[PDB]
A paper describes a structure:
A-1(L) is a Myoviridae cyanophage isolated in 1970s9 that specifically infects the model cyanobacterium Anabaena sp. PCC 7120. Using cryo-electron microscopy (cryo-EM), we solved the structure of A-1(L) tail machine, which consists of three parts: a 205-Å-long neck, a 1045-Å-long contractile tail with a complicated baseplate, and six pairs of tail fibers. The dodecameric gp2 portal, the pentadecameric gp5 and the hexameric gp7 sequentially constitute the neck of A-1(L), to which five neck fibers are attached.
After multiple rounds of attempt, the structures of gp5 and gp5-gp82N complex were finally solved by imposing C15 and C5 symmetry, respectively. Structural analysis showed that the neck/gp5 consists of 15 subunits of different fold compared to those previously solved counterparts; however, it possesses a same 15-fold symmetry as the recently reported collar sheath protein of Agrobacterium phage Milano that crosslinks the tail sheath to the neck. At the 5-fold vertex of A-1(L) capsid, the 12-fold portal/gp2 dodecamer, the 15-fold neck/gp5 pentadecamer, and the 6-fold neck/gp7 hexamer are sequentially interlocked to form a symmetry-mismatched neck. Moreover, the trimeric N-terminal domain of gp82 (gp82N, residues Met1-Ser125) of each neck fiber attaches to the gp5, whereas the C-terminal domain of gp82 (gp82C, residues Ser126-Leu241) and beyond of the flexible neck fiber could not be modeled due to the poor EM density. In detail, the ring formed by Loopα4-α5 (residues Ile83-Tyr99) of 15 gp5 subunits is hooked by six long α1 helices (residues Met1-Leu25) at the N-terminus of gp7, whereas Loopα1-α2 (residues Leu20-Glu30) of three gp5 subunits tightly interact with the Loopβ5-β6 (residues Thr70-Lys75) of trimeric gp82N. Each neck fiber comprises a trimeric gp82 with the N-terminal domain clearly modeled, followed by the highly flexible components gp80 and gp81. The results showed that gp82 indeed possesses two separate domains gp82N and gp82C, which are attached to gp5 and extended outwards, respectively. A-1(L) possesses five neck fibers with gp82N tightly attached to the pentadecameric neck/gp5, representing a neck and neck fiber of distinct symmetry.
Author numbering:
A (entry chain K), C (entry chain J), E (entry chain L), G (entry chain M), H (entry chain N): 9 to 140
B (entry chain b), D (entry chain c), F (entry chain a): 1 to 125
Write the structure that this text describes.
């Protein structure tokens, strides 16, 4: 029961387009490694449009779904081709790739550089501010 | 409009100073004069652990049900009765539940004794 | 339930050619990263013929459908040739290519350069004004 | 409220000095005027091996409960009986441990009849 | 039964999010390699947000789960393709890499470089105080 | 507490020297004023083959059930009876897991204290 | 029956978090190769933490389990693919790898380097008091 | 009925940790090559800790077990895949490797340099009391 998941599961008919709550903002900040207080980050938080917010929330939900699916599937890889069902051995690689794709998608939504965070590695552009 | 008061304390009566909790109206409602869609509000604890919410009574025409999430992550779903007077949270949380386990019993190992102590008053004459 | 998804669900027989709703304009800007203020963008809407509008709406519907299918299909890829059905391990790549094709079609209908957007990164034309 | 006291010492009866000891509530409890969600506290033994927990007399609406985690990570289950005074942890450790080998109204009846016999002795007055 | 195991098992509805316990803090220190008393470590422990600690606890639970799974599997690897179920011989490598990723995830949540610890091996971004 | 200057001898009547003996308490034991968690201690035979120990008797409901491990691979169970005097290991090993009875004095003494407080309150009322 | 094996058998719920039993210290010093005193070992035991000790005890428990498993396995390796169950000819090598990882973990949590010990083979971070 | 076998079978719930009678020192000497009279060997025999003695005895028992098993195994190797059971043709090599591993383990426990003895070959460290 992730707090963001427990917030979202109420809005079954789509997702709300009001604004990002401190929980949602905190989660996004964590996902792109941006401390909230950063002036550029908050400045980006302004000028937000409706569909932008909606897509951000959808991407966050997808992040949570894939993250859960990873721990679900890690028990697999124990075997290959049970009877005829061969197992996609890089499947976990696909999960990681889609997850980083979602993170980069968020970064593009906020127009902000994607920096070293908890999911992606080595895709750290111009550090906290311009750095490396 | 009512004010939901709630005092939160550690297990040693120490206030949970600066901790977070949430409230939501799960089903958006309205009155003859206003529209109240689904929204979620967040709050922190004061130095006393007290938190005050500005809430709407669940007199909605269609439906109206609040739900509060604590740091414990337990969900207390409740309805605010009509009226404008401020109401203590414990009152509306009064809709709690009970489960069976022997561990609830040791309090009787005093209370029953105290109840047995009450029997002493009988001989006071 | 995406907002524009329902908005189009109302239009069951084809799609209208009247204008671009603020949601549609916002989604286009999202797809190609053109803030609606940019005169170079708004002028594109001006003098935009009808069949062009129909094509825009068709492409947007396709973008939504393919994007949803992308999230849906991730739970697959666990296996290969379950009993006799081997599956394209690149299927996700196929839908990514389709999405980038759709956004390029969008940008080309408006004669505008496709810039860094959520779907394409580092493979785009002209950037801000003349970047690429 | 109650300053639950406890003394710990090795087989040599030498007290354990400044050793970690843990205590945890198991369910949020609230009285009419206050609310006590889950929390965990820690103590360190003194030079004499003593330790004090300002625990709450946990007779409340919901299932009040405590677990004590010893230096050997053994878990003792017990819920504080009501009262306002320091209490020696051995008493609850033996009474709360009545949950273990939970003799149904046999040990409790043993104590009840012992209380009755004490009252009978007191009757001489 | 690990201390943290039972500690969390008493909480079934998600996980508690108030604060990190001295036991949890000690576990984090141990699994990252930071001595508990290090000033930079305690400073990083300050100013955390709720979702941060929630993710930390999720990562710790995953660490413990995968650690146990590592122990239980060694009795396997005795054979290969018992009758037709062939097992990925690198399952051990997979779980080891997953553990390393989780530790790096912790390090990135704390914003601190990961020093030499039990799980990491030769891939560390720290020394005594800083600069690896 | 109780001591045990038990002695161990080599087969040729010479005494073992610097050979490790072990004792382990198999039950978390606790008296009124102390707790004795499951702990294990080790000792070394003196130059003359004697070994000393400091152990506690059955002070809880569960058995103060020690087991000693000899250098010759053996294990031997027993419970040290009460009193304050050194014991010879021979007799205790001859016996073993003697018996145990419910001792609720920790409960009974607290009950007596609480009852006396209640009676004093009745007198003052 | 190993002494420590019985001592741990006494602990049904996890293992105690108290100071190491002098026999435990003896065994871990054997695993690393210290005479229970090197002016470094005791100071490693001067700095103690609760979760530390539990990790030490579980690691040494695994050391014992793996070593006895190795002792038992040698009777196998006579054959391969009895009917279809093949045998991992590298199984014993896997056990060796696990044992060396365990002792490495012991040293790393104790913050100390590993000298030539009974299990590790030429892979050392130490000689006498210092050899790097 | 090897003398050490007939001595150990009297102890069942483990092995004693009292001391080493001349039989065990003689066997260790033979396995190491040091005549028991060598000062560098007898002095090493001192300062032994109980767990060290237990480990020495376990290693000696394993030496005996593997030595006996070698005699049985040679009656195999006349065949390969009798009906469906393939035979590990290097099994004898595995037994030899385990024996040398145990001998080296003894050497490490006694801290002395493993050298000429019945089992090991060419892994002669220091020859006679000084680097060979």
């Amino acid at each position: 029961t992730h707090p963001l998941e427990s917030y979202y599961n109420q809005f079954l008919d789509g997702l709300p387009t009001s604004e990002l709550e401190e929980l949602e903002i905190e989660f996004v900040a964590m996902c792109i490694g941006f401390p909230r207080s950063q002036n550029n980050f908050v400045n980006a938080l302004l000028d937000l449009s409706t569909i932008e917010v909606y897509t951000i929330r959808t991407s966050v939900k997808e992040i949570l779904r894939l993250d859960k699916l990873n721990k679900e599937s890690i028990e697999n890889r124990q075997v290959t081709k049970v009877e005829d069902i061969t197992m996609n051995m890089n499947y976990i690689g696909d999960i990681k790739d889609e997850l980083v794709t979602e993170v980069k998608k968020l970064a593009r939504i906020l127009k902000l550089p994607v920096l070293d965070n908890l999911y992606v590695s080595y895709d750290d552009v111009e550090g906290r501010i311009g750095a490396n | 409009m009512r004010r939901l008061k709630g005092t939160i304390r550690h297990l040693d009566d120490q206030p949970w100073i600066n901790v977070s909790l949430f409230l939501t109206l799960i089903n958006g409602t309205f009155n003859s004069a206003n529209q109240y869609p689904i929204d979620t509000k967040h709050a922190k604890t004061d130095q006393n652990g007290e938190f005050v919410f500005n809430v709407v009574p669940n007199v909605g025409i269609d439906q109206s049900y609040y739900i509060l999430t604590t740091p414990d992550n337990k969900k207390h779903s409740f309805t605010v009765p009509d009226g404008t007077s401020d109401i203590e949270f414990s009152v509306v949380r009064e809709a709690g539940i009970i489960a069976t386990d022997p561990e609830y019993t040791n309090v009787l190992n005093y209370l029953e004794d105290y109840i047995d102590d009450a029997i002493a008053n009988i001989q006071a004459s």
